[PDB]
């Protein structure tokens, strides 16, 4: 009531039209709540027993009297009256508004008020009455079982009062309804006032829109705007028996097996014939073409070149070269160029090596590093050679052995030269002992390493000379001691069509990359030889590859190192790693194409030779596809040949064995001993061929991505797609078009027999597959319907974050006929610019239902990272494909745990389950039943097959899905959506293929047009596009194809089960992405095959002619039929990439791994170095660091990831000159260290990989901020003020940009705006709105920073804004040559930074920042900003760093076992929040004013009707915890990252049993740091589960102690009480199964408890080992060495003193002579032993504690006293140690040996033990302890917890739910409810003094009287029932003082005013009985004794003063109102007085 008044008063003050919407909605929510509360309070005070708060339905039933077990059994039941899916579990917890109990009748009243009562009525009834009726029926059934004395009945009432209170009377008549109506009218008037007077005019529309959904729910949706009615498909009559008969016809003849048998004689023979085909399909060569670019030669340690040393070198070089005699035109040109260079003026020489700013142009020098050579300066032959250059197929005889021998000799010599040594944070510890020592320290001295560094210098010079202004001029650089001398030529500029850079590479002959058969010549100076290489041309893509050849080779070698360590379990030997590095480098600097194809095909060749049956011949043919030209290709081919033959020969064995798969022994057929797989490069041998496949994959990934995109491959794929289209027309001409499209029929197939071909499907087969899939989909119709209806068919199309992505997407056809290649985000803008509205997905299909689908080949140079695939399509095609794929993914996700696998992180259960069934089936036998009981034994054998059937194929008629989808059982009540999908498939059937511009130019620019190409131009009639039917052009029809394949496989299963009923053949499969795993089960005779060879013969004789294919090798005739049936659906099992296995363990292991490692981490690692964003420094370092953190996600070990990060940082610090000693080093200009500088200004960086794996990408800046603020607050060091000034300068330099951010991209701190290559042109529509308009619009409609707009008006603006975003524009043109070259340019001395609106060099920015910091001064605003940032914004990221600095790693010396590769998800933190709708919606709701903003926010949000509430809640925290205000946009921007859930779908490839928790995966990474040893992360070995276990243990011991101290039956109690997952019995079971988590004071009792319940003594004896122990363990990488020279030790010790399970880590920092003793031991004797051991260890090396005398230390310390030792803050003056850190997190359990002589005491609440008979007695544990933070109010009861006590029976079961339990335990006051108490009094209990009061009433009133017929840390409840009885009263509050006159007056008045004889006392309300007893407690004691006289005196007063009941105080606690009201509610007045 008063709530309305105070809201009124607080709202009146606000002036009209001044409140924003959000507060208005808040106020009206409050007013509605208060108005509802008025009626709720009325009902509660009038009728309900409830008077304080609502109670759950289960609670009310418990109060009723029904035992708990009934409810518990009822819990599992699901309501059948509610088809939606409501569960009774959720039904219990809901709280009806009001409840009342009368006998077995329960009356629930739900109170609501609404304008339209009928709605409230019907909705509330539908919600509750159905479940209530179900419960009524179930409890009636239970009563009929003899469980309940009488039935229970539910009387559900609803009181729906009109908003105006018109129907108050009829709904609920009362004596005060008028005031209720008054209040309702006033509150409604207040609603009107606030809604019409207290809002801004601009925001009124938004407010009304909000109410339309919150309080109105009036506007009714017009269905799904209706869905058009397209024609459907009528099912045809197809019976499986027809297909079975056809198979019986087709399985009666010989059938060739598709695949071949893997035999060494066969694999070797395929090569010998493919060679004899290759050498004769091509002409013959005899001059191996050059393969090496840049032929260096190093014979000395290489010093990196510098501008100075370069001068001296180049001088010495030309000193050498000039006096040589040229003999070839190239040598002549070199001689002339050297002559010109040496003879240059000193001014020219000065300007040559000068920066671009100090450059002074000269006659002979025009640009730095270049000079001009003119015709007069040159020579005749050199001039002719220049003219020939500017004015500008055969294969090696691979068959011949001579060529192979020569090439092998050459390449092996080169590789032996690169192997020739030259003649000169936690992770660091491991990286120095494991990766460094064995990889870097072994490669650092190789000729490859130094040559690798040399080629960097030769590539940097070329890159610099490739500039537009430098190209046309010559140049002459030199290198190491004038040995290698680069002679660049006047190359072409960047331009297009190849920026061919031409150069010559004269060098000194020696070991290294020298190939003296392709050199232009070999000049001899007598003492040495100089090799003048031929002029070599290189383009950008093949120049970047060489430029980072060393880094790529080193990362490849590191990955190979990792794989070898995982495989062999030990580090490689130096020779192997050296050879591997040499091979990787040689491949890296030979980025050709043929090798990139050989290695690509080898990945699939390897599994095709390590399997019984597979098709190798096709793959081996693929090897001989392109001509073999260079010696390197022939060498690689020879090495392959040898390796493949050796691998194949291993199959001559396959001895059967047993291993144990999953959980079954299981037989095998594996080549275990004599099958070890060789290695491709070195002389090592791998245990598992998985390592070989990984090595070959690493070789393949070394080749540039650019290469796959080459014009030849574009022509190849164009012809591939045209060829299949041409054949489709051949079929459409041979047969009717309808036959090809709709599909032929069975009666035609079994009359032609040739229609069983690809691109021709069978209608009957399709229908039968659909029916077979329905057989399994018919059991989950409801789930399928829900999934289909939940795909959001009624949401705006372009608003989805997949239609406004960056993926490639064809656009509009230009005038010339060629089709554009725009991006999807552009297309959304283009359609939205001419739409006027945003159409739903279905609606857009209706509009674009006539535009023929168009598609084209993606543009390589416009290719995008997000673009996966190779074809692009226009908007109508994408819409249709989205419809189809959404429908089929909704349908196909309901069999995702049986046949297909989508998610669950990355689930294998579909395949894992299939194997388990097959494995169980195989472990058995079959008895084929002949006549009589005589059986034939048969041994069941499996035969696996792994084929990729689901993959898109170039020829695959898509019409089949038309018929298929018609029959598929979707479960929808109607066929509108099914028909929509059918029609969609009918519009993606005919497509227009548009031929590319590049191919158009190429084919036109060629003299010869072969017939192989003539047809390709006939397909296109207009020379620009043709018609392709069937093939859907690599569209995203993934799940649809998978479902179709699964349906056809099930069809084959059913077909086979009918063909051979007698046999027990088993077939089971499972799909995953593009690959499946078919498990064919087949039978073989156990005998010599005589009985079966007769049974089959007699079967064939009988007439079952389909038994000729089941005569031998059944699995062959199983796979034949399966393939044929799959081919009936146009699915053709690939004859190349298939693998049949006899159930090897290696086969299953590799297949399962292939389903978890989606992308090898090499690809990612090698991708980091190349293709940097180019967005500057902080965005190049950040991008590279981020792509090297995604490689750590895909299995890459932390050490290799750290190496990759180090290389990427070294590279990124060389483009911008940020490394020490370079130009832009911050320390040169700034006044702070190089590691204490903000990253954007050129700091160092985090540089770790764990800090970058969990924390983030820019944690260096956050740590800088935290340190600076903490120091500048606690101190005032000017250095930290300088740092803060630098950060403020960065901010000031960041806010001068334009407006762009959004949530998830908030870039706090600052960022120097590095110049970005602006594209020549601008993307269409990117400039639709002026940048000024965008800035203001963004600053105005802040909401759209968080929620994608949904209206066309506010969506075009958002899309165009997204276009104008640097990270997007740069992403679009990543492959653009201009951007690539700009990236490769050394941005060192160029003006690239932006300062004050001008382009300046990074040095200028550094100087300006330094000046700003010098002049910087602190202020309130920026200090507050920094404090808020560090404390709140970057708060979820400091947590990770603090986590990673508290974990002590320790190397338990062993070898780590390698397990499977599961893929968990790195959910930052799994939680169940109290705020729903997601922070984006909640915040966007706040900053929303326009009506459109309401429309966008409400639709996007998930529970709109609660959005407001969320905000309120979100406020309470931000002020309660942080203390900040939210009402500002800037503070919200600051705090948004702290709340916004990351929502990052991060998948990590962990190995073994690793939970999905983020801490778990981080712990696993910390356990994977060492490749060969086993780390044991110390803290807790893992720290919701832990704290829940802690609370459960606390309650368990608490109840144990209480019950044993009160003698109650704890035994049954522990079966009864329940706690959020199980009962205390199950809690103890879990404790014993896992282990009592370590705890300080509860272990001591947790063991006493367990030993007395379960009988196990594990915990009790375990605690007794903490008594004392030893076993000091060590680390393995920080062991201290012994020295007899000093008689001491030396080194960094890390011993761990294990006192049972109490660890004590001791570390000794040798350099600082310090130590950090971190322990967990907390007792005097144990800790004395700890000091004994640690002091011994410390003295041994020679050291002593940091002793010191402190009277009392402020913090926690280990002060010494005479009594002994003790942690904590002391006061007593005594000596103290230092460095003593008590971290209880180190406590970790471990199996311990030895027993104690232990005896228990006092019912087992104490325990006293001894080590043995020798040791003295010691008190081990006792229960006299006090526990804190114990959760009593979560205890629940499952059974009747009976509490017989003091010979008194109590029923505590409802008290459990009441929550008063604790009070009862602690004898604390409380107020019992009325129904709960009445149930506690279920057993009769009456007040004794009532008898004496009745006697007094009889004495004074003989007639009217009562009718009593029918009758520290120990708490013990000494109080009898009086305790709970007094819970309503207040005990002695009545007191023993009494006034007899008052008591007599009250007694007479009550007797004369009430008829106490109306009903017997036993038939009243127990609670009111207690109330009246308390009112009359101890009343007659002071009256009866002298009554005979006292009454007389009372009478006198009645006749003397006329006393009244209001003037009488009974003793001291007169309560007239309560007494009268309760008596009236329990006693009617006198009948005579009623009339008056």
Swiss-Prot record:
Changing residue 36 to A: Complete loss of cap-snatching endonuclease activity. The keyword Ribosomal protein does not apply. One of its GO terms (molecular function) is metal ion binding. Mn(2+) 2 binds at residues 54, 97. Changing residue 54 to G: Loss of binding to 1 Mn(2+) ion. Complete loss of cap-snatching endonuclease activity. The active site is at 124 (for endonuclease activity). Residues 932-1118 form the RdRp catalytic domain. GO terms for cellular component: host cell perinuclear region of cytoplasm. Mn(2+) 1 binds at residues 36, 97, 110-111. Its EC number is 2.7.7.48, 3.1.-.-. Keywords: Cap snatching, Endonuclease, Host cytoplasm, Hydrolase, Magnesium, Manganese, Metal-binding, Nuclease, Nucleotide-binding, Nucleotidyltransferase, RNA-directed RNA polymerase, Transferase, Viral RNA replication. Mg(2+) binds at residue 1075. Inhibited by 2,4-dioxo-4-phenylbutanoic acid (DPBA). It holds the Pfam family Bunya_RdRp. The N-terminus contains the endonuclease activity (endoN). The central region contains the RdRp activity. The C-terminus contains the cap-binding region. RNA-dependent RNA polymerase, which is responsible for the replication and transcription of the viral RNA genome using antigenomic RNA as an intermediate. During transcription, synthesizes subgenomic RNAs and assures their capping by a cap-snatching mechanism, which involves the endonuclease activity cleaving the host capped pre-mRNAs. These short capped RNAs are then used as primers for viral transcription. Cleaves ssRNA substrates but not DNA. Seems to downregulate the expression of its own and heterologous mRNAs through its endonuclease activity. Interacts with the viral nucleoprotein. Belongs to the Bunyavirales RNA polymerase family. This is RNA-directed RNA polymerase L. The lineage of its organism: Viruses, Riboviria, Orthornavirae, Negarnaviricota, Polyploviricotina. The gene is L.
